[PDB]
Amino acid sequence: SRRARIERRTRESDIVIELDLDGTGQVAVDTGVPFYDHMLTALGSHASFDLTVRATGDVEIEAHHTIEDTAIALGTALGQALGDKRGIRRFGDAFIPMDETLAHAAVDLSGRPYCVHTGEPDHLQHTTIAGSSVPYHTVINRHVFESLAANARIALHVRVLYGRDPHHITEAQYKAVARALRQAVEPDPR
Amino acid sequence: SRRARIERRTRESDIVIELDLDGTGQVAVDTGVPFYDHMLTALGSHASFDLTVRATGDVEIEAHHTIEDTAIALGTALGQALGDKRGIRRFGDAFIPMDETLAHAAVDLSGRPYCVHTGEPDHLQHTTIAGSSVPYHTVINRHVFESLAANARIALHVRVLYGRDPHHITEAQYKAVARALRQAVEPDPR
Amino acid sequence: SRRARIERRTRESDIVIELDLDGTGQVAVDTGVPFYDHMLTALGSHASFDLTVRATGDVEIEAHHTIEDTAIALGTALGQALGDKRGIRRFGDAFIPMDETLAHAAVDLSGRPYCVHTGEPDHLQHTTIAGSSVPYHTVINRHVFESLAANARIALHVRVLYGRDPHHITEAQYKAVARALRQAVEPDPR
Amino acid sequence: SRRARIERRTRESDIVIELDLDGTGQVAVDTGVPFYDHMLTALGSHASFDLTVRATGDVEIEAHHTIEDTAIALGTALGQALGDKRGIRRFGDAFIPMDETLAHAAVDLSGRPYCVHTGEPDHLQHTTIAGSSVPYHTVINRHVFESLAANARIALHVRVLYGRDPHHITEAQYKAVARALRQAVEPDPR
Amino acid sequence: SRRARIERRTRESDIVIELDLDGTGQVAVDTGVPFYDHMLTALGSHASFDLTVRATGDVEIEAHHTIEDTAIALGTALGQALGDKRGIRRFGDAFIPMDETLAHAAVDLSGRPYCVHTGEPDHLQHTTIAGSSVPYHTVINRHVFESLAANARIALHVRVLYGRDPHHITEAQYKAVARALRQAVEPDPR
Amino acid sequence: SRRARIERRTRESDIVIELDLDGTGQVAVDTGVPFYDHMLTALGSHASFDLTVRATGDVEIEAHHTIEDTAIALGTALGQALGDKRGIRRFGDAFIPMDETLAHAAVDLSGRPYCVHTGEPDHLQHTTIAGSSVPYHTVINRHVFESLAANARIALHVRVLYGRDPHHITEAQYKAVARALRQAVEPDPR
Numbered sequence A, B, C, D, E, F: 001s002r003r004a005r006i007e008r009r010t011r012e013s014d015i016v017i018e019l020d021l022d023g024t025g026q027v028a029v030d031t032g033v034p035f036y037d038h039m040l041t042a043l044g045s046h047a048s049f050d051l052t053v054r055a056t057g058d059v060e061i062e063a064h065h066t067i068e069d070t071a072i073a074l075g076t077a078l079g080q081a082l083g084d085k086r087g088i089r090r091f092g093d094a095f096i097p098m099d100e101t102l103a104h105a106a107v108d109l110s111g112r113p114y115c116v117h118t119g120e121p122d123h124l125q126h127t128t129i130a131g132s133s134v135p136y137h138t139v140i141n142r143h144v145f146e147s148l149a150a151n152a153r154i155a156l157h158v159r160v161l162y163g164r165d166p167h168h169i170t171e172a173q174y175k176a177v178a179r180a181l182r183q184a185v186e187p188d189p190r
């Protein structure tokens, strides 16, 4: 009913997305960027989407092309699956407490791309989240939200009210976007 | 069930309001102030009210007396139609993204008039929205929210978190108020 | 189903709490601190809890030990009654207008204690609310929210956006927490 | 070869665009907003496009819906007519002196919507250009550039280095965008 | 006609460059520093050079010696291939929009080495671009432009007007230099 | 075709100008002010004009009357030789790197005299360039650009982005103006 399959093959990367808006949080994400997988898994889950994301890309350069291409493909999928947008809440918002962090997100499935990203502390624009694999530069948080909004053709406002930990700040943001989308895509009983 | 018809005849103007709180967004507004009609139409619509507004007034002087008298009559109608306020959510709030603008509104159908209007950029206190008809001075936004709160006997808090375009800032505010009212007037299942 | 009875006997005080999360606002509070009773009654009521609170303590010293011990016992009760936390909204938030005051609260029933208390004007850290009985020092607002979060094992973020009256600022906060809890403990249909 | 016809009918307005990128400046614009017609005529002309723009809309409210809808339809047309974007310069830029004003524009026909609008003096965010017809609020300059970039799927950077007259500042900007587009859409001999 | 082959063997590294100024963007770069390869590939491509770069070096220490030695060898090649500099445009410049970033570059193939690097945000002087291989410290951007200018014996001015993402800021700069070189090396018809 | 001969005899000086816009840089300048000759030679050359300038004047007072009268006569010549201005690019601009200096110039052969001169460091308004002959006060740079624009009836914007050496700052400016004129006077193929 509200499903979309997107394939996006560039010189930089290969993306397959399968998205059902009316899911139960059945989510599997594999981008080669494990922190990004964790964020996109928290997004799909907290949005009660069924989401499959399979991505390979030029992670020898860094995560950027794969992160952006995935966010672009995911946006296209959200847009396609929404279709005519008949009888939906359309507007949604969500606060996400995560220990010391508070994030907020607000959406208008308007058909008019716009992203406003505010309140993220300045140290996130050169912070790295690094494990045993390909690292995640938090400077990309904004890039992900803008790419998502641009390609889904929605108004997305993402706010950090406050926070310290870059992992908490990033996850709370992805989760805020997720629960804001969840409210907005729900059928409107009126 | 939750309907009210208000007639308000002053030396300055003539207002007829018909309001059903349990509507499907069937809205018709004619004040002689076309931007005001657009705002009151977005309010009635986004609140899922059925709303009729018919107003004539001294627009040769300017929109002010007609805008205020309409907002006063509309408040009286909201108050009357709410009646005893038994079993309603009572509290409501809504974020409205509109491109670069973010507006918020929060209501307590408390029975105690109060309006707090914050965050509206200072250029709105001398900005004009002008077409081929009677213009709308955005300095009146506040006046409209105060008149509404005063005559509905509710607590209304309207916030501009940020924004640039005076049309976006004004509409987002009217829409925020609308969706906050919509949540608050809904039957409370508990 | 989601009920808990907590008894907490210290050298300082004696607390009995009976809490049903799936209540209809049937609330009775008696701490010997009448303003505190009013706040805990507004919390239980606005959360649609059924809540009984019976507390006696060393109010000859002042309200502090009784207020804290009650908040601790209440948290333990909220935590116990929540149990496994299966199928709940988990996240909740609420704006509370109260005349000139606007308060906000956001919860994650995460299982990870955290409290962030922001925006409360500085005069509240030495303000007294005094009647014909034991007075309430508003400096304790924070202490109550921290004790609640610590013992329920939840993330609680409480914000005063603005306000002047210490009674309005305090009640709006307790009410915000209540409606945020109410949303978060509701069954999640997905 | 590089032509597109766009029809955009909303509740607010009706737009017909016919655009040839390989034109000789044969341009006719009729929006009901005469200053906007002058700007879109200078854009089509200075870009050496052949451009027809026919628009009717709710100018009784003000120019905004008609201006935005036209800019949206024009962007869609630019995007469609560009097609595969094979063998074009792709990047373009232009300085426009206009008496005391200096404007600049830079484009990447990247396929990735982005607009950056900088240097416009603050008085333009509440300035009106008014004649015998429907007026033009210069606050809309930005809205036009963003809508254009969003719907053509291009990177558009528009800069006011300096200027005083709102007519000079606005026209120089439209002309800068035009000559930047003209360079970028030219066949690349390599 | 305008070709050069440079071999540069130091204790630190081994470089082979083959450069044709009159190319069609046939570019292959392998330095062991994959982000650097991406930047030098965007430079060769956007300059319509045919460029081969093969480099091995002490990347166990870090990318610096290999990045610098390559930039030095590339400069020597640009200088040699330019020869007498008869009948060329000599001056070139280019703006590069890249999402939020705007970069500019201006060249005088003067025969007089000079580099001015301005506007790069301060976080780039300790930012890392890290993938699955050898990382790239953006502090080296300047070093690359200076080495290039020093060894090609040209005036190179590289400017960041604004930008946030370190990947966008760096690539836009390399691309600006490329398109500025492309204009300047073109035959001058006069 | 695009040639002009101007004679200007005042009490202060005698000027003969012969100007061909479609030249090959065949330039001869003799004003009695050798630095001025060098600047006007770089202007004629870099503009691909054929230019003859012969001037005698009251250099016992200082260079000013001769410099201004020459700039006036040169402007008259540029204006006359341009004639109807049919089928020309009309707009032109050029960046000039000169070691540490960056200058820019932008022209609109609009028929409407205007000069904006910005960014020149303050020490140039009392700096002297002195050899074995009549010296050149750099305070006259502005006077030359204004006289040129006034008498050619063009919009001339001259900018120093930065620089230190007064010889580099002055020459880069004259060269910027020259290459901006060269682009603008070229036949427009469309």
Ligand SMILES: NCCSc1ncn[nH]1
Pocket (backbone or CB within 6 Å): A012, A064, A065, A068, E167, E168, E171
């Ligand atoms: N995928 C290539 C165009 S977008 C980009 N962002 C960073 N580098 N390239």
Ligand SMILES: NCCSc1ncn[nH]1
Pocket (backbone or CB within 6 Å): A167, A168, A171
């Ligand atoms: N272990 C999951 C809940 S706590 C957390 N901190 C960072 N991410 N998640």
Ligand SMILES: NCCSc1ncn[nH]1
Pocket (backbone or CB within 6 Å): C167, C168, C171
């Ligand atoms: N009388 C109850 C509503 S108004 C109020 N002010 C302080 N507490 N309540």
Ligand SMILES: NCCSc1ncn[nH]1
Pocket (backbone or CB within 6 Å): B167, B168, B171, D012, D064, D065, D068
């Ligand atoms: N065309 C309606 C959606 S966009 C808008 N801008 C101003 N009002 N509405």
Ligand SMILES: NCCSc1ncn[nH]1
Pocket (backbone or CB within 6 Å): D167, D168, D171
């Ligand atoms: N008359 C056209 C050239 S001058 C101008 N000022 C404002 N617009 N155009």
Ligand SMILES: NCCSc1ncn[nH]1
Pocket (backbone or CB within 6 Å): F167, F168, F171
């Ligand atoms: N020798 C000519 C190129 S370098 C220079 N410095 C000052 N004028 N020219």
Ligand SMILES: [Cl-]
Pocket (backbone or CB within 6 Å): none
């Ligand atoms: Cl989680």
Ligand SMILES: [Cl-]
Pocket (backbone or CB within 6 Å): none
């Ligand atoms: Cl709408």
Ligand SMILES: [Cl-]
Pocket (backbone or CB within 6 Å): none
């Ligand atoms: Cl109450």
Ligand SMILES: [Cl-]
Pocket (backbone or CB within 6 Å): none
């Ligand atoms: Cl908020």
Ligand SMILES: [Cl-]
Pocket (backbone or CB within 6 Å): none
């Ligand atoms: Cl014109």
Ligand SMILES: [Cl-]
Pocket (backbone or CB within 6 Å): none
């Ligand atoms: Cl590219």
Ligand SMILES: [Cl-]
Pocket (backbone or CB within 6 Å): none
């Ligand atoms: Cl030279």
Ligand SMILES: [Cl-]
Pocket (backbone or CB within 6 Å): none
């Ligand atoms: Cl510039």
Ligand SMILES: [Mn+2]
Pocket (backbone or CB within 6 Å): A064, A068, A143, E099, E168
């Ligand atoms: Mn990118």
Ligand SMILES: [Mn+2]
Pocket (backbone or CB within 6 Å): A038, A167, A171
């Ligand atoms: Mn995590």
